[PDB]
Amino acid sequence: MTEYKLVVVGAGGVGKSALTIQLIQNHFVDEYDPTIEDSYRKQVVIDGETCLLDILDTAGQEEYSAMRDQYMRTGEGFLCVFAINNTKSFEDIHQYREQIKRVKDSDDVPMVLVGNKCDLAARTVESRQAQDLARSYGIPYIETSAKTRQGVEDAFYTLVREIRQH
Ligand SMILES: Nc1nc2c(ncn2[C@@H]2O[C@H](COP(=O)(O)OP(=O)(O)NP(=O)(O)O)[C@@H](O)[C@H]2O)c(=O)[nH]1
Ligand SMILES: [Ca+2]
Ligand SMILES: [Ca+2]
Ligand SMILES: [Mg+2]
């Protein structure tokens, strides 16, 4: 049994908590309670390997973000989340990527770009734009919905598969 330390980052309200809770607890959180710093742990079998996921759900709200960098340091792979109906959250990804590079002191950190809320039709970030951003970082882009479960396993398990490539 291997442990994978995953960290979920991104702007306030994009659905980091809802994603993590859908993965771990199999329900959708409809309300919006801003996070400070929460952790989740679960044993899961991923590609035939029994492993322990330790997931750090981080704050996106500036007001709640004290010491996020000290949490982020510990991470082995990052889910960089934006919402497909929130163009500013997508623009913000560059700054999260810069933060991750600064806390890991590496240009080569396991990451997945996640476009969440794909159940919603008020899309302002087209798939291709995010594909392009992810291509520039040499990482995958995956769309998710914490509400329907679309892509949610695939996002987190892809991040583990990325960690295994480094
Ligand atoms: N339709 C839809 N709503 C979503 C989805 N994911 C999250 N939401 C909603 O968006 C709001 C914010 O979600 P939440 O998970 O709290 O966002 P967050 O990124 O963790 N916010 P913070 O950074 O403040 O902790 C909630 O009302 C939640 O139900 C999704 O995939 N689809
Ligand atoms: Ca609910
Ligand atoms: Ca550093
Ligand atoms: Mg949250």
Numbering used by the authors: 1 to 166
Reproduce the article's own wording on this structure.
We solved a new crystal structure of H-RasWT·GppNHp at a resolution of 1.56 Å by using a crystal with a space group R32, which was grown under a condition distinct from those reported previously. This structure corresponded to state 2 as judged from the presence of the hydrogen-bonding interactions between Thr35 in Switch I and the γ-phosphate of GppNHp. In State 2* and State 1WT, Tyr32 was found to exhibit alternative conformations presumably attributed to its flexibility. In State 2*, Tyr32 adopted two distinct conformations, (a) and (b), as shown in Figs 3B,D and 4A. The side chain of the conformation (a) formed a water-mediated interaction with the γ-phosphate of GppNHp as observed with Tyr32 in State 2 while that of the conformation (b) formed a direct hydrogen bond with the γ-phosphate. In contrast, State 2* possessed WAT175, which established a full bunch of the interactions with Thr35, Gln61 and the γ-phosphate as observed in State 2. In the other alternative conformation adopting the conformation (b), hereafter representing State 2* in this paper, WAT189 was missing and the Tyr32 side chain showed a shift in its orientation and established a direct hydrogen bond with the γ-phosphate oxygen atom. In State 2*, the side chain of Gln61 seemed to acquire more conformational flexibility due to the loss of the WAT189-mediated hydrogen bond with the side chain of Tyr32 compared to that in State 2 although its position was not so much different. Moreover, the positions of the Tyr96 and Gln99 side chains in State 2* were almost indistinguishable from those in State 1WT and appeared ready to accept and stabilize the Gln61 side chain at its position in State 1WT when the conformational change of the Gln61 side chain has occurred during the state 2 to state 1 transition.
Ras function as guanine nucleotide-dependent molecular switches regulating cell growth, development and apoptosis by cycling between GTP-bound active and GDP-bound inactive forms (Ras·GTP and Ras·GDP, respectively). Ras·GTP binds directly with the effectors such as Raf kinases through its flexible binding interface consisting of Switch I (residues 32–38) and Switch II (residues 60–75), leading to activation of the downstream signal. 31P NMR analyses revealed that in solution H-Ras in complex with a non-hydrolyzable GTP analogue, guanosine 5′-(β, γ-imido) triphosphate (GppNHp), exists in dynamic equilibrium between at least two distinct conformational states, called state 1 and state 2, which are characterized by different chemical shift values of the nucleotide phosphorus atoms, especially that of the γ-phosphate group6. Because association with the effector molecules such as Raf induced a shift of the equilibrium toward state 2, it was thought that state 2 represents an active form capable of interacting with the effectors while state 1 represents an inactive form with a drastically impaired affinity to the effectors.
